[PDB]
Structure formats: C-alpha cells, structure tokens
Copies of this chain bind each other. A is one copy, B any other.
C-alpha cells in the first residue's frame, strides 16, 4: 500500500501547485475570501489563521465550501 500513499501525495503536490497558479492568475484575494468563509469549516478557520499564506489550507477550505470577496478563488 505504500506506493499508493506516496503516489497520492505526489498528485496532491501537483494539484496544490496548479491551484496556486490558477487562483493567482484569477486575482484571488485570500484574506477577503477567508474572512467570509472562516465560520463555515475547520479548514477555512485554519486557513484564515495562516492569513491565506498556506495554499494547502486555502485549497482544503475552498473544496469544503455564496461567499462575498471570493472572486477568483472559486
């Protein structure tokens, strides 16, 4: 099973990179988005606590979530 775990971690790192590039290109404002989403999930609260600077937490937040200020963050 260990090859599968390692493979999935590799795919996660690739997705995080792709997500960072795509949201940056769309001018996502993480702090305004996360202020709106923080009460909605544990991931969003954690992402706001890191000021939006932790892309894996930003990604988990968006995947978990009509929020104002989230244009370009999807």
Contacts and interface: CB of A to CB of B under 8 A. Distances in A.
Q: Count copies of this chain in the complex.
A: 2
Interface in A1-23: 1-2, 4-9, 11-13, 15-16, 18-19, 21-23
Chain A interface size, as a band, is 35 or more
Interface string A43-56: 10110011000101
7 contacts: A1-B25, A5-B72, A8-B22, A13-B63, A42-B54, A57-B57, A57-B60
Interface of A: 1-2, 4-9, 11-13, 15-16, 18-19, 21-23, 25-26, 28, 42-43, 45-46, 49-50, 54, 56-57, 59-60, 62-64, 72-74
